[PDB]
Amino acid sequence: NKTVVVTTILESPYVMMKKNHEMLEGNERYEGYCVDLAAEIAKHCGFKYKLTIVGDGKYGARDADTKIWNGMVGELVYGKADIAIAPLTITLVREEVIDFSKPFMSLGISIMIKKGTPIESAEDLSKQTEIAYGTLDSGSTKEFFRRSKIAVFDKMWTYMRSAEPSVFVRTTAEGVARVRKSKGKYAYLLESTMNEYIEQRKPCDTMKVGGNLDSKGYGIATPKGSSLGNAVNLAVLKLNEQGLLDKLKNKWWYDKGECG
Amino acid sequence: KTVVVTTILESPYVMMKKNHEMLEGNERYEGYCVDLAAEIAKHCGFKYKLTIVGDGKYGARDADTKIWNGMVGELVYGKADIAIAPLTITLVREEVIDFSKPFMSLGISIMIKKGTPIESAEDLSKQTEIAYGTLDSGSTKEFFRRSKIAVFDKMWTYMRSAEPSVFVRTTAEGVARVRKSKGKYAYLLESTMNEYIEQRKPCDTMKVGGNLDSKGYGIATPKGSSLGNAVNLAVLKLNEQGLLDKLKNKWWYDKGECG
Ligand SMILES: N[C@@H](Cn1cc(I)c(=O)[nH]c1=O)C(=O)O
Ligand SMILES: N[C@@H](Cn1cc(I)c(=O)[nH]c1=O)C(=O)O
């Protein structure tokens, strides 16, 4: 009755299925930055845990009508999971219904373009349409544009939700794929961490251009008020100060980089 | 009840304006954190008074007396209600005061005079012809003093005993030393400040290599204070709305002096 249920999401290189996952079981079926972070937190907080992939594969949004949550956030909110260890962005609306540790990773929305194509900035994109651009059809990135009060980003939002040929995508894979075949006619807006990862994987034909549009962080989430929150938060700060969080990113991002 | 805010004078976060002597109250000050204090106050619905921390320190616990000094101390021991300054969120501090999620992200970095043949902390650690140091107090210094990583440990062992003291008392001091050392001094400081100085005349400094760590500054309140929740949500809201980035651009770039 003491095992901690960890809700997470299959997103490379955070949580991935090991090659021989079929001959494995339990937490051993998975590997990745977050699988490793889960092990380190558990050790530091002294608890057993079971990794479980979020059922609807969503991060966490609330319906404006019903006010019901889905994704990992919903798992925590509705008593399904005891902790969320994944690339979950710390946001206002979420902070109101669940707890978040201080960030374990710092990032920001960035611009992905087809390598060999002209550099583009948010400003640049907002002033045209020949080059289509969009975001994941759900998540904090799409929300950023919907709730920002910055002229440039508001202009970009108006354009994106109005773009007849939908500029949104359902998965990171889709966005990346779209960038790779659009010959510069499609710029994908995604979190810098993922942009950096893809840039380190074959075919190596994409790249992060310009600075980030904002500064956010991923955090470990627990149900509102959970006593597990305090220890977890302190574990994150300790892990970061010991340099372990940095070694984890180098391991899963740059150590096996395949683009030079 | 007027909320007592403790902060510290450091450009461009908090600074007494030119003819501040002709003004009064909070109007005497200006800066990124002065603007941030007004934004937090408004969103939380409280009146406040800006005060400069008595001992000019950020916050550390004397290992011999166990007493906290600086802004952390003013919060822990009842002198201030909230701290709005470039205060780094750390483990030891987190244990005694509450921190909002970061309002700014940064990391330790290297400042050098353009032309200096250095490109990384690794390079620095491997020589001494080019001296290098940090502020004589604060988390930047602590990073090295408490580090257990070989490269950083070597840097620290060098720094603590460097005959001509490599430590500086203020940012202004470390910057002047870089500019006047003919390329023989590299100053280690928080990236955001490195980026600021880079926008100031005579535009002769630069940041090399990436940051040594990744952390953030947070608004701090006394442990258990009922002000914490509202403050945290205000910071997140201000960030999401883009105001935090507008302030950064305001004090760093719109006001920049290096084209
Ligand atoms: N972290 C987000 C999800 N998420 C992920 C990626 I990778 C991206 O590019 N954009 C997002 O909104 C959340 O928590 O909703
Ligand atoms: N943020 C630090 C203080 N601080 C400030 C600056 I500006 C810097 O360059 N280095 C520091 O350690 C703390 O909280 O101690």
Coordinates of C-alpha atoms in Angstrom, one line a residue, chain A residues 5-90:
Chain A
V5 CA 2.3 5.5 -8.6
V6 CA 4.2 7.5 -11.1
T7 CA 2.3 8.9 -14.1
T8 CA 4.5 9.8 -17.0
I9 CA 4.4 10.1 -20.8
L10 CA 6.2 8.3 -23.6
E11 CA 8.2 11.2 -25.1
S12 CA 11.9 10.8 -26.2
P13 CA 14.3 11.0 -24.6
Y14 CA 12.4 11.3 -21.3
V15 CA 10.6 8.0 -21.3
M16 CA 11.2 5.4 -24.1
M17 CA 10.6 1.7 -24.5
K18 CA 13.9 -0.2 -24.3
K19 CA 14.7 -2.2 -27.4
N20 CA 14.1 -5.5 -25.6
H21 CA 11.2 -4.2 -23.6
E22 CA 9.1 -7.3 -24.5
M23 CA 11.5 -9.5 -22.5
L24 CA 11.4 -7.1 -19.6
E25 CA 8.9 -6.1 -17.0
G26 CA 7.9 -3.4 -14.5
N27 CA 9.9 -0.2 -14.6
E28 CA 12.7 -2.1 -16.4
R29 CA 10.7 -1.9 -19.6
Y30 CA 11.5 1.8 -19.8
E31 CA 14.6 4.0 -20.1
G32 CA 15.3 7.7 -20.4
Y33 CA 16.0 11.0 -18.6
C34 CA 12.8 10.8 -16.6
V35 CA 13.2 7.1 -15.8
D36 CA 16.6 8.0 -14.4
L37 CA 15.2 11.0 -12.5
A38 CA 12.5 8.9 -11.0
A39 CA 15.1 6.5 -9.7
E40 CA 17.1 9.3 -8.1
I41 CA 14.1 11.0 -6.5
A42 CA 12.8 7.6 -5.1
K43 CA 16.2 6.9 -3.6
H44 CA 16.4 10.4 -2.1
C45 CA 12.9 10.3 -0.7
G46 CA 13.0 6.6 0.3
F47 CA 10.0 5.1 -1.6
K48 CA 9.0 2.3 -3.9
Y49 CA 7.3 3.2 -7.2
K50 CA 5.7 1.9 -10.3
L51 CA 6.0 3.8 -13.6
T52 CA 2.7 4.1 -15.6
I53 CA 2.2 5.7 -18.9
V54 CA -0.7 8.2 -18.9
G55 CA -3.7 6.6 -20.4
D56 CA -4.9 9.4 -22.7
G57 CA -1.3 10.4 -23.6
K58 CA -2.0 14.0 -22.8
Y59 CA 0.0 16.4 -20.5
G60 CA -2.8 18.3 -18.8
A61 CA -5.6 20.6 -19.9
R62 CA -8.9 21.7 -18.4
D63 CA -12.1 21.9 -20.4
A64 CA -13.5 25.4 -20.3
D65 CA -17.1 24.1 -20.1
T66 CA -16.9 21.2 -17.6
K67 CA -13.6 22.2 -16.0
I68 CA -12.5 18.6 -16.1
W69 CA -8.8 17.8 -16.4
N70 CA -7.2 15.2 -18.6
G71 CA -3.6 14.0 -19.1
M72 CA -1.1 13.5 -16.3
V73 CA -2.6 16.4 -14.4
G74 CA -6.0 14.6 -14.3
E75 CA -4.3 11.5 -13.0
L76 CA -3.1 13.5 -10.0
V77 CA -6.2 15.5 -9.5
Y78 CA -8.6 12.5 -9.7
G79 CA -6.6 10.2 -7.4
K80 CA -5.2 8.0 -10.1
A81 CA -1.4 8.7 -9.6
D82 CA 0.6 9.9 -6.6
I83 CA 3.3 11.8 -8.6
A84 CA 4.1 13.0 -12.2
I85 CA 7.7 12.7 -13.4
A86 CA 7.8 13.9 -16.9
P87 CA 8.4 17.0 -19.1
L88 CA 5.4 18.7 -17.5
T89 CA 5.6 22.5 -17.7
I90 CA 4.9 24.5 -14.5

